Amino acid sequence: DGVGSSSGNWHCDSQWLGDRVITTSTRTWALPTYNNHLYKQISNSTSGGSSNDNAYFGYSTPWGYFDFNRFHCHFSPRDWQRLINNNWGFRPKRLNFKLFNIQVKEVTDNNGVKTIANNLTSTVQVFTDSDYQLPYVLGSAHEGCLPPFPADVFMIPQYGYLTLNDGSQAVGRSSFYCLEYFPSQMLRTGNNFQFSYEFENVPFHSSYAHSQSLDRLMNPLIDQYLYYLSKTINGSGQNQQTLKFSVAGPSNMAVQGRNYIPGPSYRQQRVSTTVTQNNNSEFAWPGASSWALNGRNSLMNPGPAMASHKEGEDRFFPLSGSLIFGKQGTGRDNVDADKVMITNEEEIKTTNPVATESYGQVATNHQSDGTPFKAQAQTGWVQNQGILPGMVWQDRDVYLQGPIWAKIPHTDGNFHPSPLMGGFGMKHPPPQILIKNTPVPADPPTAFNKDKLNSFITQYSTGQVSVEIEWELQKENSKRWNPEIQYTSNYYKSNNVEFAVNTEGVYSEPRPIGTRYLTRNL
Amino acid sequence: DGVGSSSGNWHCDSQWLGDRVITTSTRTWALPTYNNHLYKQISNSTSGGSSNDNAYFGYSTPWGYFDFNRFHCHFSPRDWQRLINNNWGFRPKRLNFKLFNIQVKEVTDNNGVKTIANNLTSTVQVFTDSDYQLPYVLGSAHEGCLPPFPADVFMIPQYGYLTLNDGSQAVGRSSFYCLEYFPSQMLRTGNNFQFSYEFENVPFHSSYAHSQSLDRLMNPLIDQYLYYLSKTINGSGQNQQTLKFSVAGPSNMAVQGRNYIPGPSYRQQRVSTTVTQNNNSEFAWPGASSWALNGRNSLMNPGPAMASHKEGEDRFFPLSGSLIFGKQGTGRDNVDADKVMITNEEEIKTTNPVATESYGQVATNHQSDGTPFKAQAQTGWVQNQGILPGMVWQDRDVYLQGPIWAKIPHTDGNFHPSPLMGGFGMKHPPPQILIKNTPVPADPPTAFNKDKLNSFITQYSTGQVSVEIEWELQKENSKRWNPEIQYTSNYYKSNNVEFAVNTEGVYSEPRPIGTRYLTRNL
Amino acid sequence: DGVGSSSGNWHCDSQWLGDRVITTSTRTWALPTYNNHLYKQISNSTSGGSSNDNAYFGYSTPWGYFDFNRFHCHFSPRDWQRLINNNWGFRPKRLNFKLFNIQVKEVTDNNGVKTIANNLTSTVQVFTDSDYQLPYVLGSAHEGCLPPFPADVFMIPQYGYLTLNDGSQAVGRSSFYCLEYFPSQMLRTGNNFQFSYEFENVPFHSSYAHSQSLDRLMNPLIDQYLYYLSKTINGSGQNQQTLKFSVAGPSNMAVQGRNYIPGPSYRQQRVSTTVTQNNNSEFAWPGASSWALNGRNSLMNPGPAMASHKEGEDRFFPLSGSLIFGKQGTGRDNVDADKVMITNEEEIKTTNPVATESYGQVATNHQSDGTPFKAQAQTGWVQNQGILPGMVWQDRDVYLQGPIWAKIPHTDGNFHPSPLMGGFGMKHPPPQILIKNTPVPADPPTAFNKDKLNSFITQYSTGQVSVEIEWELQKENSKRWNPEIQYTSNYYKSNNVEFAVNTEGVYSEPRPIGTRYLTRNL
């Protein structure tokens, strides 16, 4: 436990012990000095102004935090392929976290010459928010995760949070959090940090696609014993009203009585990847589904889990109803459609309604012959449908580069708190691990000054972080006779191997990989 | 356990042991050879074509299956009357199933003369899908159940199933199931089959009607301590705006604050049994409520549990919001209204909204005097209302000829998975019992041929099936003073006794019998 | 154990218990009377004459035999997909065989009317050749196996064998075997037959493809410490002979010294599936590789395991170097290339030489300047290469519809006795199970006659056969980062599901499935 002794080893592999997977990931991180050791109030005013919908108020802290809330942080693409091709479900069970091999380095820039030296006596501060007393910024699909490639060195993102705002201003209910008010472990080189976390009970993720649709669960050979209204008029002419009933059978599956109905919907605008088929107007914001909160409009993104498109309409995607990942090297603003990877939520069209279609039709009046307007039967489209009893649905798929978990907001009530971006919703998710370099002041004046010191030695830290997660598996025991669909590589020759490095050593993920390849009955 | 020894006895009675009922039913079945021992791919194309909404893809198997998912399979009408007149609730607890007295018979048709002989060495195959690995076709309200009359001999329906389809075609995710891939018990004459099943915990069915409505739960003698806005203008004329408040009391029950609100609605078209009152147009399909799934429209039938009609409007029924049973001898297509029995869901008007009415009104704008349009208060009808917190409702009633249970689809999420057609929703319902005659080939050629044999001895099997179900009872302990409504026969003379046989030995059920005759408070 | 009691149950499923698979298959068979209960000498003369290469001598017995020496007899396509996608190797360990539900039926044809009746007292004879005293006809890729689809009823093939021949004649060393000279179990209806067999130790089948080639096993960054002759002349002109040596390095991988060399070769003629590229002549027999035995030419089919084609030359296949399976419904003679499925042995091009190429070049002379002919260095192509020390190779792949095992001939010596058609070579394979209906004579004359009876009651038997095989698994533990190639179905829509039945109930296997999808290093 000294300068010349390593405080940990590199553990990066996966063990498949039957119904369990234990994934271990080790990475090398670099933590700079954020905010010059200061807490700073931030708002849209300090960011250059914005609209009402984009107004915010918060604080940026000098702390960094560790993010491993993405599946590629733990699963290699081959491990992901094994998991998705051989299992009907999975869920996290246990977590082990390690910080070790801490190195604090001081940087001196004299006459433009940058020299870096070791600071053996400097300390790095780390603690976990095990009581969830801090704002939870994981589960917001942020950058700064452990890189998917184990050989990549990553920078720890800076921790900030938002509070209640009235425009760019704060209200009396706004909370300010000082992270130095928490007990934290102080680490010199030779010290290591470790903590274990047990995942709370969450349902298995449905890593399967249904081979039956909700409207085709009947026996296609046997009639029903239920009748339906099939004819209301005997023919053309006046006063031909009648009531005729027929048996609902295989020839007319649409009218058959059913026990369960598709899940809820919140219609999204339909956008074509073939740009010539889209309207010649700007409708990204104006034509998007949204919800209002305290007078602020927020995009419904990705919203309720719905089928991306109908059968054969692969070129259509909902405006903001799907996760859109960026390809390697993709820029930040105004990138083309070929530089992004739009996830396709088609496997749930068997139970979930299509995102870009109406849920259905409802009657809107009373048809009558008189007493005295002679109104015909009128129907209206259902653009948004809330939860009804007897409704079943599938949640959004998880992806190799997608999020794993989210914190369920602490509220009086929630319904199906599975995160909308996909993953496992927990009231007590893995706690935030916050890290920060302890400030080392420069030489103070020889005469006392009451002002806080504002000159510090330039410093940064580096080290290794190890995350070990044990996942429970739900083995598939299907009796299906024909072979299933599996995720596979394509044998055809290419310049580069997919999910490998290119000639410049740049690792890339060419496509998003879901979990729903195996098949289950409804 | 031989040819000359019976392998079981006839058990058909009910025992009322206080808080439990044990119903036993024995029937004689006949199982033919289905599909000539073949699995056949079926689709709407092979059925003669159809529309997009009626397209399907699946397989017809040579197997038959046992159906007893109807209440008249276990309850005699007198037993049903006892149950509905003396109990506030009931639910299944245990199941016992028996197959015995198997007789396999061979049929030879020589020169048009049909002679039937015993085949003592032939075998019948039976197994239960206890792991739910096969598509579940029970819970689709299909024919082929055990006949309500114990003296009737019934034919076992053929088992088929549907998979994913793209029109009449299959997709790569479509599953083919071979039922010979399951271990099954092989029965000659003298062998019997038996298995027991324990029903999973389900809520008691509400076999009661509420004597209080949701909007009349207050004390009709005492005022509330809450106020409501009663007047907004002092009188006729300009600039008369004001705000007047009044105590919500017995004189104005409509404006009283309430804790709970009626359940969800999905408006249905209103149809009159008096055909002269209906519109002179065809609106059975065009005017019907529906939901869309993968671009296919399916009738909302019967949909969410809603009151069939308002008070006094017994002639009105929702277009597809109620179960319609056929009378004895009713044909298949285009039968008159007198040949069907339309169930009436009126007992739930105390908590559930009327199926053919709007849920209510919601404000659609901001009323104002200016700043500058002078908009009045505008309201819009709510045709469909999803689940809101604080909402209570009653599920659909069960009937003597209605279904008992349904399999909850295996999905990530569901809400109130009680089946919409009525009954008990279970994740592990009673398993499908599949039966099939083992093929007995005719004489093969004396020279080897690699082709599968396609000439078989014509065979069918017959036997007895016994189903014993134990039901838990919820005894009523009402303190109501006046006598209750009970189901009763009418003493008035008639040509035939109801729920008996006619002069030709034809058993008939004259009317549908619900469960909601006793009374409970809200 | 009587007429009215079943003697066994239908067992058809697979259990995946980690490192083991237990596949159980049950089928319905039909055994006719073969050869009219007679042993008949057969030869090419009795078959209508032939050439010298096709001459044979043998006997056809009245016995049938059970064949399950094909992988689709035990593995469903989904089980095969699991095995090939998740395992690096497999091998059989144990066998269990069952005959039960025997039914012997007599056929009487009076005046052209065929009536089939049960013969309860008739007996079926079955025994296993556990001592391998009979000629072994399994392992010859014959028809008559258990059908891949469990619902198909198959006819048991007739047992025959060949002995030494001189043309159509026999020699003194020819052996005649009477199968009634073996003790056999006699089964009436109600009797069952069972025996267990333990597979002898065989190597795991290599169900993987190499990700490294034999000529690319070096470090591509480091030179070798070995030198090679790079230049023999200083330039153009007389008397320019020299000897220059260079380091074998990454720039010249062809000349690097290597420890191991590709396996043996026996060149095959190259045939193009594009018929316009083939020579306009008949070369199927004349241009084929063959071996001679006692003056008889036999096709080298499929011969030593060699790569089917070079990279990119998928249209080329060796003339007789690959297994060619027939599609469902394919005829017997002169069928088109689209009616057969030619297996492609491309995964072994990393270690095995291409079947249609020369093994390499060898020097054929001494180059010299004189003493006095001035001979240049001459090389000759190696069309066939025997085993050399330091040679490594991969055996032929196994297929879902391919053979499982073969009997190693009882000889003084053999090398690598893995069967050339693919599978596991055993000195004591699963024994032949031979079955035959016991002859039931018709009414004999009332006066004694010494001649053997030649009038018998026409009879055939039917029943069920159960085969259970336990396979050991070699789990893969690869550290490869990128996803692997897996066998998968294609999601694209089609008229029929692959590996399912069509609209006429005809099961088909659309393509051959190998075992080599996972990846291993060399």
Short mmCIF file of C-alpha atoms in Angstrom, two decimals, chain B residues 1-3 37-43 46 57 59 62 106 108 110-111 118-123 125 164 166 168-191 436 438-454 456-457 459, chain C residues 2-14 24 28-35 74 76 79 100-103 105 107 113-116 118 120 143-144 149-158 189-190 460 462 464 489-497 499-507:
data_model
loop_
_atom_site.label_atom_id
_atom_site.label_comp_id
_atom_site.label_asym_id
_atom_site.label_seq_id
_atom_site.Cartn_x
_atom_site.Cartn_y
_atom_site.Cartn_z
CA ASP B 1 -56.14 -52.70 -16.99
CA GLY B 2 -57.16 -54.83 -19.95
CA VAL B 3 -59.64 -55.15 -22.81
CA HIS B 37 -52.27 -37.35 -40.19
CA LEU B 38 -50.61 -34.34 -41.85
CA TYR B 39 -49.47 -30.88 -40.86
CA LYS B 40 -50.71 -28.40 -43.45
CA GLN B 41 -49.74 -24.78 -43.91
CA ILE B 42 -52.87 -22.62 -44.01
CA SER B 43 -53.38 -18.99 -44.98
CA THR B 46 -55.43 -21.25 -49.18
CA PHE B 57 -50.69 -17.54 -41.84
CA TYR B 59 -50.74 -24.46 -39.62
CA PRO B 62 -53.67 -33.59 -37.06
CA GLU B 106 -61.37 -48.93 -37.71
CA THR B 108 -63.66 -50.06 -43.86
CA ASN B 110 -66.01 -51.75 -49.37
CA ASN B 111 -68.41 -51.32 -52.31
CA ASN B 118 -62.72 -52.63 -32.98
CA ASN B 119 -58.96 -52.13 -33.26
CA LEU B 120 -57.79 -53.41 -29.89
CA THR B 121 -54.08 -52.80 -30.52
CA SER B 122 -54.45 -49.23 -31.79
CA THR B 123 -53.24 -46.36 -29.63
CA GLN B 125 -51.82 -40.14 -28.08
CA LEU B 164 -46.66 -13.92 -37.98
CA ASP B 166 -47.17 -10.51 -44.19
CA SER B 168 -50.75 -14.48 -46.94
CA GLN B 169 -46.98 -14.99 -46.68
CA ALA B 170 -44.76 -15.87 -43.74
CA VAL B 171 -41.79 -13.96 -42.36
CA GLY B 172 -38.51 -15.26 -41.00
CA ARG B 173 -39.78 -14.85 -37.43
CA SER B 174 -42.71 -17.21 -38.06
CA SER B 175 -42.59 -20.34 -35.90
CA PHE B 176 -43.58 -23.85 -36.96
CA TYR B 177 -44.54 -26.22 -34.15
CA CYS B 178 -44.62 -30.00 -34.50
CA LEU B 179 -46.71 -31.54 -31.74
CA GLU B 180 -44.94 -34.89 -32.17
CA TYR B 181 -41.87 -33.15 -30.72
CA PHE B 182 -43.52 -33.35 -27.30
CA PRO B 183 -43.49 -36.44 -25.08
CA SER B 184 -47.01 -37.86 -25.03
CA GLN B 185 -48.65 -40.79 -23.30
CA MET B 186 -49.73 -43.59 -25.64
CA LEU B 187 -53.04 -45.21 -24.69
CA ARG B 188 -54.51 -48.48 -25.86
CA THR B 189 -57.92 -49.63 -24.70
CA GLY B 190 -57.65 -50.30 -20.99
CA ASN B 191 -55.23 -47.41 -20.43
CA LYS B 436 -54.63 -37.57 -31.57
CA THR B 438 -51.76 -42.76 -33.73
CA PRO B 439 -51.59 -43.44 -37.48
CA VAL B 440 -51.88 -47.09 -38.46
CA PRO B 441 -50.45 -47.61 -41.96
CA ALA B 442 -52.14 -49.84 -44.50
CA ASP B 443 -50.15 -52.61 -46.16
CA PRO B 444 -46.84 -51.19 -47.45
CA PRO B 445 -45.28 -52.36 -50.73
CA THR B 446 -43.13 -55.48 -50.65
CA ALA B 447 -40.24 -53.47 -52.15
CA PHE B 448 -38.63 -50.67 -50.18
CA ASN B 449 -39.69 -47.10 -50.95
CA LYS B 450 -38.11 -44.06 -49.32
CA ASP B 451 -41.29 -41.98 -49.51
CA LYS B 452 -43.34 -41.51 -46.36
CA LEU B 453 -46.41 -43.72 -46.17
CA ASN B 454 -49.60 -41.97 -47.29
CA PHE B 456 -53.54 -45.45 -43.66
CA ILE B 457 -56.29 -47.50 -42.09
CA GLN B 459 -59.72 -44.92 -37.79
CA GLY C 2 -51.22 -57.51 -22.93
CA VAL C 3 -53.39 -56.72 -25.95
CA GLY C 4 -55.18 -53.78 -24.33
CA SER C 5 -52.13 -52.18 -22.69
CA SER C 6 -49.65 -49.90 -24.44
CA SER C 7 -46.05 -51.10 -24.19
CA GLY C 8 -44.44 -47.66 -24.40
CA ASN C 9 -44.92 -43.92 -24.67
CA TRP C 10 -44.04 -41.27 -27.23
CA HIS C 11 -40.73 -39.64 -26.24
CA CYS C 12 -39.58 -36.96 -28.69
CA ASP C 13 -37.70 -33.96 -27.28
CA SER C 14 -34.22 -32.70 -26.43
CA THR C 24 -35.00 -38.45 -28.12
CA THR C 28 -43.98 -44.85 -36.50
CA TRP C 29 -42.65 -47.59 -38.78
CA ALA C 30 -44.20 -50.16 -41.10
CA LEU C 31 -42.46 -53.45 -41.85
CA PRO C 32 -43.66 -55.46 -44.87
CA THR C 33 -42.83 -59.04 -45.78
CA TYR C 34 -39.62 -58.87 -47.79
CA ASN C 35 -38.60 -61.44 -50.41
CA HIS C 74 -32.17 -36.87 -33.76
CA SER C 76 -34.57 -30.74 -35.07
CA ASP C 79 -31.67 -27.96 -32.00
CA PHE C 100 -42.92 -50.95 -28.68
CA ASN C 101 -46.61 -50.91 -29.59
CA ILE C 102 -46.14 -53.75 -32.07
CA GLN C 103 -49.15 -54.43 -34.29
CA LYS C 105 -51.81 -57.12 -39.38
CA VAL C 107 -54.12 -58.68 -45.40
CA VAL C 113 -61.36 -56.29 -52.13
CA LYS C 114 -58.53 -55.59 -49.68
CA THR C 115 -59.42 -56.00 -46.00
CA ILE C 116 -56.90 -55.63 -43.17
CA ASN C 118 -55.42 -57.67 -36.64
CA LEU C 120 -53.03 -60.78 -32.27
CA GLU C 143 -32.08 -44.37 -47.59
CA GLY C 144 -34.54 -45.74 -45.06
CA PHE C 149 -40.18 -34.90 -39.48
CA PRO C 150 -41.54 -36.73 -36.40
CA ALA C 151 -45.05 -36.97 -37.89
CA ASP C 152 -43.93 -39.02 -40.91
CA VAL C 153 -44.48 -42.79 -41.09
CA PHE C 154 -41.63 -44.63 -42.78
CA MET C 155 -41.08 -48.07 -44.27
CA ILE C 156 -38.23 -50.18 -42.90
CA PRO C 157 -35.61 -50.90 -45.60
CA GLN C 158 -34.80 -54.46 -46.60
CA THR C 189 -48.44 -57.28 -29.44
CA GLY C 190 -47.86 -56.14 -25.89
CA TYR C 460 -47.14 -56.66 -42.23
CA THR C 462 -46.32 -51.52 -37.58
CA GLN C 464 -43.15 -47.20 -32.74
CA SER C 489 -33.08 -17.76 -40.75
CA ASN C 490 -33.80 -14.86 -43.09
CA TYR C 491 -36.57 -12.53 -41.95
CA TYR C 492 -37.64 -11.75 -45.52
CA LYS C 493 -41.15 -12.91 -46.37
CA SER C 494 -41.72 -16.16 -48.24
CA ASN C 495 -44.56 -18.44 -49.25
CA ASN C 496 -43.44 -21.15 -46.83
CA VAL C 497 -41.46 -21.28 -43.61
CA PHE C 499 -37.85 -26.38 -42.38
CA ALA C 500 -41.65 -26.59 -42.12
CA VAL C 501 -44.49 -28.20 -44.04
CA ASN C 502 -46.04 -26.78 -47.19
CA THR C 503 -49.76 -26.55 -47.97
CA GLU C 504 -49.82 -30.28 -48.79
CA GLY C 505 -48.18 -31.33 -45.52
CA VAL C 506 -44.85 -32.10 -47.18
CA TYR C 507 -41.86 -31.44 -44.93
#
